[PDB]
Design a protein around this nucleic acid. Structure first.
Lengths: 105, 105
DNA sequence: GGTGCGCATGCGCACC
DNA sequence: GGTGCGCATGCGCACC
């Protein structure tokens, strides 16, 4: 874990939302923003090993969330929505920002 | 004029900068963000008449600031940097956010 | 609502 | 520093 004061608050267009209530569409939009704030870089570097975050979930490929590239079997163990929530949850935890993650509870 | 509480503050990565001291590079980055906050839309709609802001400067084409498309003569009356500052200044004025524009003075 | 995908668009490289 | 430009990338359309 490595604290990052710079992760955004779990709000969309201002309204506070918990990660568990974000829609698939909202998550897909939130995740690149979280990555920009998380790394300071303007571009995620999707797919490049050198840019794979340490907290990236293991049963998801390091790939643009634009289009789910998981294996068909991977898609049965976990829904694409649950997978996108794991991406967010894993990023906030690894930065020790559980305060922000569980704020809406 | 139409007040917009939602225009960003004239800061880059946190540091406050006046529009007159922004570098060409910084301006090119700032302007699309200003447009997003200005309109609520995710995409500027560069070139489309239906999206041309009313405050757009007259001696600049409605075109991605990525690449200066002004006529060669237009480029002599006004430098590309001065042109990009006019874009910002005109947007903040038309939204009545002179408080933000002249903050650093 | 979920999700693939078309493509506009802005990050940052390249070169002066 | 200035600026053109290559192209990765995420907004939002399309369709279920």
């Amino acid at each position: 874990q490595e604290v990052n004061s710079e992760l955004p608050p779990l709000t969309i267009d201002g309204i506070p939302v918990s990660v568990d209530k974000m829609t698939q569409a909202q998550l897909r939009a939130f995740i690149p923003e979280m990555l920009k704030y998380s790394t300071g870089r303007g571009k995620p570097g999707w797919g490049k090993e050198s840019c794979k975050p340490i907290w990236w979930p293991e049963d998801i490929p390091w790939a643009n969330v634009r289009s789910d590239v998981r294996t068909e079997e991977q898609k049965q163990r976990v829904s694409w929505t649950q997978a996108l929530r794991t991406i967010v949850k894993n990023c906030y935890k690894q930065h020790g920002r559980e305060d922000l993650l569980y704020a809406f509870e």
